């Protein structure tokens, strides 16, 4: 009866936007229910054959922006986050799942930058980031969001969003 398994740290971010860690075959029946158009994948590692067959069967486009893992206190790639954000803000790509390995750091930073574009105060952005990152919350991830300059994205409409 209970049989659907969302991927690790799965959540709905907004209308047409999801976040998680790395899906495996146990999660495919759940992800099929979302009717995804796109995945934004933030790790450099090649997509496993299992996941590639799932994308092909379901007509899902893979956007890969490979952000190299780093541990505190040693550099979040502004350019890769911004390339991912440009794809995320295009409603033609929705519904879209953002994922990394566990969906805490790279995924957390991309979602936090979306919230800054949505005009959330920093403490509200950090609270949501911390909910997922839990004991692995990094000051460096929040600093990245704190200094992220919204200028180049500020004209992009979000009529997709629940938040008008
Ligand atoms: O605290 P560290 O510096 O030891 O981080 C560990 C690991 O934490 P753990 O050691 O408690 O298991 C992280 O997992 P969590 O903090 O998300 O639970 C993991 O991030 P991740 O989940 O892949 O990243 P997202 O998908 O969230 O972006 C990270 O991978 P990378 O930074 O991409 O290299 C690892 O670094 P290393 O062991 O050198 O490969």
Numbering used by the authors: 50 to 123, 125 to 214
Q: What does the report in the manuscript say about this coordinate set?
A:
Although the WPD loop is missing its canonical tripeptide motif, this structural element contributes to catalysis by assisting PP-InsP delivery into the catalytic pocket, for a choreographed exchange with phosphate reaction product. Subsequently, an intramolecular proton donation by PP-InsP substrate is posited to substitute functionally for the absent aspartate/glutamate general-acid. Additionally, we conclude that the hydrolyzed phosphate remains trapped as an enzyme-product complex, until it can be released in a prisoner exchange with another PP-InsP molecule; the latter process is assisted by the WPD loop.
The 5-InsP7 substrate is held in an 11.6 Å wide and 15.2 Å deep pocket by polar interactions between the 1-, 4-, 5β-, and 6-phosphates and multiple residues in the P-loop: Lys151, Arg152, Lys154, His155 and Arg156. These data also reveal that the His155 imidazole ring is flipped (180° χ2 angle changes) relative to its orientation in the Pi-bound crystal structures. The 1- and 2-phosphates of 5-InsP7 also make multiple polar interactions with Lys186 in the α5-α6 loop. Ser150, which replaces the catalytic cysteine, is located at the bottom of the ligand binding pocket and it helps to trap 5-InsP7 through its polar contact with one of the terminal oxygen atoms from the 5-β-phosphate moiety.
